[PDB]
Amino acid sequence: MIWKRKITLEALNAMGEGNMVGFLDIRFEHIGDDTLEATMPVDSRTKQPFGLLHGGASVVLAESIGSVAGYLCTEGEQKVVGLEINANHVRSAREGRVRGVCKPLHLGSRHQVWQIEIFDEKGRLCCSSRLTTAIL
Amino acid sequence: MIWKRKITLEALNAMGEGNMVGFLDIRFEHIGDDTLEATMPVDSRTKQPFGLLHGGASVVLAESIGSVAGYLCTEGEQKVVGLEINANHVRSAREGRVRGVCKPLHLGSRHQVWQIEIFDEKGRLCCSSRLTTAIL
Numbered sequence: 037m038i039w040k041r042k043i044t045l046e047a048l049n050a051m052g053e054g055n056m057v058g059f060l061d062i063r064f065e066h067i068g069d070d071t072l073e074a075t076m077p078v079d080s081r082t083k084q085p086f087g088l089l090h091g092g093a094s095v096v097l098a099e100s101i102g103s104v105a106g107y108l109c110t111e112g113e114q115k116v117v118g119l120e121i122n123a124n125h126v127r128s129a130r131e132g133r134v135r136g137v138c139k140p141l142h143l144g145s146r147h148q149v150w151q152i153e154i155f156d157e158k159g160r161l162c163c164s165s166r167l168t169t170a171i172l
Numbered sequence: 173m174i175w176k177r178k179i180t181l182e183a184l185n186a187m188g189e190g191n192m193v194g195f196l197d198i199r200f201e202h203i204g205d206d207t208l209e210a211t212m213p214v215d216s217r218t219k220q221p222f223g224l225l226h227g228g229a230s231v232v233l234a235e236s237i238g239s240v241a242g243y244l245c246t247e248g249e250q251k252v253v254g255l256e257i258n259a260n261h262v263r264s265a266r267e268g269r270v271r272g273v274c275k276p277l278h279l280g281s282r283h284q285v286w287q288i289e290i291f292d293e294k295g296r297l298c299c300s301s302r303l304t305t306a307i308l
């Protein structure tokens with residue numbers, strides 16, 4: 037178990053209300069001992085002009101999940117902030133919801149590296165991303 | 173000029189309606205002989221829960237401008253898709269609109285690389301990104 041904070045999915049989902057996370061219907065759905073998972077619809081708010089998932093929406097999902105996960109691995113007054121992000125778009129998505137799964141690559145005292153894989157509804161990899169955070 | 177397609181700012185903004193670009197009020201505002209620019213509000217649709225611009229929103233902006241620029245540099249039946257995107261978030265934004273400025277780093281026959289820098293309303297760098305596209 038990597039977490040230092042014990043926060044439920046309901047509290048996480050409550051925080052998204054009234055901001056970008058809520059606007060895109062990103063929903064946190066599972067917390068493992070070393071994973072965090074959220075889904076996002078492929079719809080008008082997340083689509084390119086001709087119906088495929090906007091690659092930027094996948095990054096919004098990746099950065100949201102990676103930041104939350106990083107924060108959960110700090111304690112007390114500590115905050116995390118994303119410094120760098122990269123993403124590889126390997127497959128497109130068109131319908132249903134995509135699902136982001138975030139795992140740690142490195143949990144440091146000063147920075148973290150997170151990997152987020154985004155899968156379509158059939159479980160195929162669509163986007164693979166790395167987020168580097170600073171702990172402040 | 174680097175462009176091979178002639179597609180006006182009016183037409184671009186029209187095409188964003190009903191999809192992610194339109195829902196975030198991203199607006200294409202300038203096309204130079206070798207640059208392309210668009211702006212985006214910092215508001216509830218693009219903010220983190222505690223009020224700052226969501227880092228994923230900047231990447232939506234970057235990927236949108238880069239992908240369009242890349243398309244405008246091809247011809248005929250050619251398509252352009254983003255392959256890899258990366259970004260450093262160097263400064264936060266909290267109000268007004270941010271502006272993305274996109275310039276080519278490489279215009280090839282099979283792939284392209286675009287640099288997109290996003291600035292707050294005062295002209296200060298907030299996000300520096302690179303997009304690699306594939307020409308299909």
Ligand SMILES: CCCCCCCCCC(=O)CSCCNC(=O)CCNC(=O)[C@H](O)C(C)(C)COP(=O)(O)OP(=O)(O)OC[C@H]1O[C@H](n2cnc3c(N)ncnc32)[C@@H](O)[C@H]1OP(=O)(O)O
Pocket residue numbers: 048049050051052053057058064099100103104116117118119170172220221225226227228261262263264
């Ligand atoms: C379902 C709901 C769940 C919720 C989901 C939401 C997910 C969130 C979304 C995602 O965007 C998460 S996040 C992903 C996106 N990432 C970004 O947007 C990061 C942008 N980059 C930077 O800001 C700087 O380069 C760094 C501070 C990084 C560098 O550190 P540095 O060595 O360069 O420090 P520096 O000398 O520059 O500045 C020092 C201080 O100045 C800043 N400051 C001053 N005044 C204010 C103020 N009024 N309000 C706020 N901040 C203010 C402070 O940050 C503070 O920084 P530090 O204490 O760290 O020293």
Ligand SMILES: CCCCCCCCCC(=O)CSCCNC(=O)CCNC(=O)[C@H](O)C(C)(C)COP(=O)(O)OP(=O)(O)OC[C@H]1O[C@H](n2cnc3c(N)ncnc32)[C@@H](O)[C@H]1OP(=O)(O)O
Pocket residue numbers: 084085089090091092125126127128129184185187188193235236239240251253254255306308
């Ligand atoms: C306001 C005005 C307008 C609005 C502005 C907003 C713009 C936003 C745009 C932004 O979202 C950027 S864009 C959004 C972010 N980017 C992405 O989402 C891209 C995801 N990545 C991929 O699809 C693949 O890696 C590649 C196809 C890249 C390579 O292939 P690869 O080296 O991985 O080899 P692989 O075999 O694994 O893949 C097979 C593929 O070949 C087929 N195929 C599809 N199209 C073409 C074509 N044109 N030409 C030829 N073939 C095409 C596909 O069906 C596809 O999958 P299948 O196995 O079922 O055959």
Ligand SMILES: CCCCCCCCCC(=O)CSCCNC(=O)CCNC(=O)[C@H](O)C(C)(C)COP(=O)(O)OP(=O)(O)OC[C@H]1O[C@H](n2cnc3c(N)ncnc32)[C@@H](O)[C@H]1OP(=O)(O)O
Pocket residue numbers: 143144145146147148
């Ligand atoms: C002039 C011309 C020619 C020469 C120029 C050419 C130069 C080339 C440049 C070169 O390639 C660049 S350089 C080459 C390439 N880059 C690299 O090699 C960097 C590799 N990365 C790291 O070291 C870590 O991730 C960070 C330290 C970054 C963060 O740490 P992190 O927290 O995120 O990760 P982590 O938690 O694992 O370690 C934390 C540490 O904090 C603690 N602690 C804190 N203060 C002190 C203290 N005063 N004294 C003692 N300890 C101190 C340490 O105990 C240690 O904790 P642990 O042991 O329990 O884990």
Ligand SMILES: CCCCCCCCCC(=O)CSCCNC(=O)CCNC(=O)[C@H](O)C(C)(C)COP(=O)(O)OP(=O)(O)OC[C@H]1O[C@H](n2cnc3c(N)ncnc32)[C@@H](O)[C@H]1OP(=O)(O)O
Pocket residue numbers: 047050051052053054055214215216217219220221222223266267268
């Ligand atoms: C788990 C336990 C936690 C809860 C404990 C209980 C707390 C007590 C109360 C209880 O009800 C629950 S606690 C609550 C439950 N929810 C949650 O907990 C979830 C999280 N909530 C959020 O993220 C927010 O929606 C934001 C802060 C991002 C909105 O920020 P935001 O409201 O500032 O979004 P905004 O769209 O406004 O941004 C930009 C701007 O638009 C405005 N503007 C410009 N022109 C006009 C005009 N003509 N007319 C109107 N507005 C105009 C300016 O305000 C301007 O602000 P800036 O100056 O910044 O640009």
Ligand SMILES: [Cl-]
Pocket residue numbers: 243250251252253
């Ligand atoms: Cl295209």
